[PDB]
Design a protein around this ligand. Structure first.
Ligand SMILES: O=C(O)[C@@](O)(COP(=O)(O)O)[C@H](O)[C@H](O)COP(=O)(O)O
Ligand SMILES: O=C(O)[C@@](O)(COP(=O)(O)O)[C@H](O)[C@H](O)COP(=O)(O)O
Ligand SMILES: O=C(O)[C@@](O)(COP(=O)(O)O)[C@H](O)[C@H](O)COP(=O)(O)O
Ligand SMILES: [Mg+2]
Ligand SMILES: [Mg+2]
Ligand SMILES: [Mg+2]
Ligand SMILES: [Mg+2]
Lengths: 467, 140, 465, 356, 230
């Protein structure tokens, strides 16, 4: 006889550890940082991750013989020891393109990160990277518009975009919201936004806000002669509510809405992205909840994967971190995933946390958004880190200006334009940054007032998510 | 506390919040275009066609999202493909503003790999424009 | 008090140790690890601020509203025994902060940004107290335990199910074949694996049709009601609804959704659809361990379980304790009560930080699944009691004689344990004896007993209290 | 009629040359959404051929650059511009961005010139539902005209689109992409005249007719033959023009012929002589290849067309005096002269394959 | 001074004939059997086919400069002489995957076979084969079911399926159609069919047919115990 059905438990490595496997150009690849329990070989641990995220279970099943396990199985094809660690390994897994539902980030996540993180046999597991092959990329609608189209629709070129989140986070009335929006926009900001948690609440219902905000947008646009927008939050408790909010924005003829894609979810987000494509709305993505998943080095999913997932699901902007602000984001790690968000082709570069060469096969780029704990003195560093293809957001840095929102906005705009001009003239912002800002505070009273209030304010702490 | 004025304080996108560009400053921006291999081009518009408006939307169903009139201006000649001489750009600015002395004129540049406008700022506004403030009359 | 621009400490506004919490407030227990040089009080106050009303510098707009009315308040900080730099910070949120009926909104505020703050090294959400006044704004589970049992006409024992294996790679016809053989042997349910949606090797509508044939055949053959959790999880809400609708039109009892990978917004939508159309909703917790495994950082599963009960689900995966996936006993008994009961008192020995009153919102059936087999049955019946579903994927399809004998083995085991417990036998002490007597009586069971006799999953627990 | 017979072993080749469609069958069809008279009336354009241009390069332009090129073409004197037949929705440019930027361009040009402008937005798509979505967006933008590739999209989709256009007041430009796969060889296939009759029944306001003088094949007598079949109410049998049957259209509207492909200013006299006024003449390379850009390119073609029309109206014979009319016009107009100079020596003269 | 805009006509081969091009695995490839006019070099003819099915037209356009022609252009990368023929060549063309609308066969046909077959500069052209790369295949829904699923739904294995078209092609009433169908299906055929030109006509309207055929299908199925269709 040949190979028959033999019931019982055997090692995962017998089927799922394939160190001689040559990956196919259509395979999805995953890089897992893996911490095995004592007495579990790295090979068996990698094989278990491969198995239980693809075709395998804990004991042998007879039904395998009806199909071709060779064709469908995930394969742990390489195991790399982590330098500086006694019990950490990078395990590399290859998944046949046949395993995945076309156009569904939900399904990709369900397989790759669905159950394996809770296996008793490991102490910690972290997904560091994913190689999405062009053949799979092409099954996604992707971003409604992307960077080029957004700039073309807004008629805005040659600098970063400027924005601000209205504050306090919660507790303002719809009328006061629109009032704050109008004062921010009229001072030189391109956008304002609903805070991530501003949806519809007893203190302010959504449709009242959309109306007052539309009034504010159009007033500032008529006053300044520049296109203005405000990211109206479509995030909601159900798909039906979310769609209601998007439809209202379409009917008001305003340019842009927002979604919290992790707390709303990938299934809702993809639907909203497709709606935005079909109705010509820009879609700003907030990453609320990401740090629950992506902060720790030993366990979770790195942000670069959640950023790739978003580019597939759909979004014209995504929050990228500031590096210099109140929230964590290491410089080299950040420059790496910004490239993954914006570029068509990114080569493997481990010094920036890029484990795989990623080809986006012309899927549009996502605008990174730098937001959180930033002010005027951060401007040179921001422009140096991000360049022109970014939105820089100043909530407190605008609504906390001693003279109000419009002077606050003008201070930020003056800062941005001075840095952009200095860079264009051949000045190095990494070093001449303070000089550019000081010359600008001396020229502009609005900017000077901001410079004085925030002069000593820095956010310097030990980094958790280190490479 | 100074108050940002809402009256006759229209702006013009990139660099419009800075002191007006000197000829040396304009030359520097042109040097930046040429150093990066971007394609220079000039655009112009009469005063009534200079700012974003909504008039066409009268013809629309509910499809006005991100539609504005007056985003497009008129192209001065053709984009300067293959131009590596900054003086040649400056000479076209002169020629364009001479032909249309009462027009708004902006300098833009294109990146053909990204296929997007990569920079742009106003180089001329008509002398009859009364809808803008000088830097020091922006707040009161 | 006028507007003063500039940065001040969060603790000046957001640390309120003399605050008496209101019965309508949402309460949160954060296990917090500050950076060196950051006082616990300032760190807790920053968590309260940035998850409610505040930002990093003073804003003038606070004066237009009432910060007292709306602000989150860190009202208590507890040191963690056994830890040099860990604290439990308790935060209270006014009910006004939250969108009625939206789990998405609740999460966005409470876990939105605060976990990424430079000023802390780690943060974990341990528990939430959801007050009756907020619970009532949610539709909640489409049916819940009592209604499910009543619709299914199944009483007096745990439900038995099985995930079809291999996870991926089987054709629609082979899928239904496997399902029919499982159901006909004594299982109540079978299920789509969490990652079986619609794929090149098997399109969803082909599966649904073959599976419906299999359900009806097994039901006619056995005389007992059968079902199969057909996966509605999809890339878009529209696809998800299309799959729910096809199940409705086939007249089948139950669908499933991956609520974390699909998301709360899609899940709530689905749960309302099930309520209005009479489908049972099985919830799979795919991805949870990305969030809930480590003690120092994330969100504990009990909070993810509360969120699901509000969002809506008739079943939720609960862990097995004894199987291939992690789940400490006392922790698991804790959140199982939170899932099923109307009222659960504070009990720190089970990880319950807050008394929870569910105000008649239906309970969610716990599902024990993953690396379990016949020898685990006494332990499962003892931990969960009757109101659970016990799932055996490998433990059915790995049987030497095939699916039907594998199903019969698990059904015999479950019924033997149930009878023994009803007769006064202590399953914790006499469990092995019950199984051995049953393997001697039943050849199907004996065959399963022999194959998995030595198979145990015993490892050091990561998520410890 | 053409379903299975062409594959029979018992024959070596088969070609369908003509069909006589009787009035009783003609009357069962909705037919063109508008037809020549109605189109001219809605556009308020009389007494000359219409002028258009395809945007180039065929593929690779962004939605913004597409509209930019469209605005410059239309402002210079062209009535229409168009999406290339293969411009649908692609990674470099998604359809709804293009529709929006093109609308802007249309309205800017119309405001600037004072003449009605349009751009044939391509509704051709992979599915009927997508094709409809695109038609509906054009309707909602209030623009005058869309296009369809009737052979690659197919008759079932085309007829549906034509009926939508009739009910919503859109003009429908038909591109004949793929026709030469079927109609080039003398021995086998279906002659274009049959494909053109089919289109008039299925529905279209414009149909590409060939140029005779341009880069693509089309013999003079053959072309005049089917142009009458597209336009006229009644066309008598005439074998010297390939008309095998007398065709009575029983008042079905006529379809505007579109001459396009490898044509430039020097062809203008011959084009006006072959087609007369009830035609659209399209200049892709002949506009976007002008040394001074699209607007001067558009002005050059418009001057040429108007000069030829004026000359013909004055009694001049364009077959004999055509060159003189163009030269007098290049001397007067600098834009025209620049065009005349670039393409002076450019001709397309090759042995004809589809001979009578 | 870099590459600028030069108006006028030049040879297609200067841009579109690229014999040293290494095809990408995402390119769509076409094999054209090409018969040039006398005096047209095969290289120029293949280049014209590549150009006018992708990005090019008959004269240079300035708008090329705004984009990257290298990225988008079709490429004639190989020309093979045909053995047994004086004036026939297989020209091989590569098309970037960016040229094509996802999920649309219509769009693929419009580019590849849209205009090139009518060019005066060729006497005959035949498209022999296309290489559809996995990255493009993956954009299509494709067949509703396919062979495995069909066989599984019909419960028919181990032999070819048997069918029959009802005759005469046209002229039968709906009732006679179902009568003929029933008699075929009951004798051992798995399927019967409408002739390709049977749609809805004065002699037989479609819905009348569908009803009588359904009756026939169900009667034969009950009679034989085998799944039947039409
Ligand atoms: O809620 C907030 O704190 C913010 O509105 C910033 O307010 P300030 O500008 O007043 O600081 C943003 O949502 C965070 O930046 C999100 O973090 P990230 O970008 O890292 O996802
Ligand atoms: O894919 C699997 O591994 C399972 O189908 C079990 O298969 P077996 O029965 O063959 O082990 C379940 O989805 C996991 O139990 C989920 O874990 P949890 O319930 O902890 O969320
Ligand atoms: O794609 C092209 O080649 C054209 O845009 C012409 O471009 P140019 O004006 O630049 O030549 C037309 O689609 C063809 O004329 C169609 O041929 P026909 O009308 O014979 O069907
Ligand atoms: Mg915020
Ligand atoms: Mg599973
Ligand atoms: Mg064309
Ligand atoms: Mg037939």
């Amino acid at each position: 006889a040949g190979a028959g059905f033999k019931a019982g438990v055997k090692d995962y490595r017998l089927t799922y550890y394939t160190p001689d496997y040559v990956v196919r150009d259509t395979d999805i690849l995953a890089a897992f940082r893996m911490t095995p329990q004592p007495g579990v070989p790295p090979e068996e641990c990698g094989a278990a991750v491969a198995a239980e995220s693809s075709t395998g279970t804990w004991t042998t099943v007879w039904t395998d013989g009806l199909t071709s396990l060779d064709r469908y199985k995930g394969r742990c094809y390489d195991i790399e020891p982590v330098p500086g660690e006694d019990n950490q390994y990078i395990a590399y897994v290859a998944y046949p393109i046949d395993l995945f539902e076309e156009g569904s980030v939900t399904n990709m996540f369900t397989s790759i990160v669905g159950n394996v993180f809770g296996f008793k046999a490991l102490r910690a597991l972290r997904l560091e990277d994913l190689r999405i092959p062009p053949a799979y990329v092409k099954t996604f609608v992707g971003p409604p518009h992307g960077i080029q189209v957004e700039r073309d629709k807004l008629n805005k070129y040659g600098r970063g975009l400027l924005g601000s989140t209205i504050k306090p986070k919660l507790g303002l009335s719809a009328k006061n919201y629109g009032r704050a929006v109008y004062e921010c926009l009229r001072g030189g900001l391109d956008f304002t936004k609903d805070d991530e948690n501003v949806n519809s609440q007893p203190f302010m219902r959504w449709r009242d806000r959309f109306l007052f905000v539309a009034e504010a947008i159009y007033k500032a646009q008529a006053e300044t002669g520049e296109v203005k927008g405000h990211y109206l939050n479509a995030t909601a408790g159900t798909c039906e509510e979310m769609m209601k909010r998007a439809v209202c924005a379409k009917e008001l003829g305003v340019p842009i809405i927002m979604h919290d894609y992790l707390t709303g979810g990938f299934t809702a987000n993809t639907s909203l992205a497709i709606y935005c494509r079909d109705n010509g709305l820009l879609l700003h993505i907030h990453r609320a909840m990401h740090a629950v998943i992506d902060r720790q080095r030993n366990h979770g999913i790195h942000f670069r994967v959640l950023a790739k997932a978003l580019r597939m699901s759909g979004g014209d902007h995504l929050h990228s971190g500031t590096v210099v602000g109140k929230l964590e984001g290491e410089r080299e790690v950040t420059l790496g995933f910004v490239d993954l968000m914006r570029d068509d082709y990114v080569e493997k570069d481990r010094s920036r946390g890029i484990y795989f060469t990623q080809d986006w096969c012309s899927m549009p780029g996502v605008m990174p958004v730098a937001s959180g704990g930033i002010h005027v003195w951060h401007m040179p560093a921001l422009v140096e880190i991000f360049g022109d293809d970014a939105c820089l957001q100043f909530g407190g840095g605008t609504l906390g200006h001693p003279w109000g929102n419009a002077p606050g906005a003008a201070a930020n705009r003056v800062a941005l334009e001075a840095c952009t001009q200095a860079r264009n003239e051949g000045r190095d912002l990494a070093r001449e940054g303070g000089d550019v800002i000081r010359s600008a505070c001396k020229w502009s009273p609005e900017l000077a007032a901001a410079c004085e209030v925030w002069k000593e304010i820095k956010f310097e702490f030990d980094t958790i998510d280190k490479l | 506390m100074m108050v940002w004025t809402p009256v006759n304080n229209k702006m013009f996108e990139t660099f419009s919040y800075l002191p007006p560009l000197t000829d040396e400053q304009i030359a520097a921006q042109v040097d930046y275009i040429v150093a990066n291999g971007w394609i220079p081009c000039l655009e112009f518009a009469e005063a009534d066609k200079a700012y974003v408006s909504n008039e066409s939307a009268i013809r629309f169903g509910s499809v006005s999202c991100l539609y504005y009139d007056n985003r497009y201006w008129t192209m001065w000649k053709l984009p300067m493909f293959g131009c590596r001489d900054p003086m040649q750009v400056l000479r076209e600015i002169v020629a364009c503003t001479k032909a249309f002395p009462d027009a708004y004129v902006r300098l833009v540049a294109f990146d053909n790999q990204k296929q997007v406008q990569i920079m742009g700022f106003l180089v001329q506004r008509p002398k009859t424009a009364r809808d803008f403030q000088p830097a020091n009359k922006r707040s009161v």
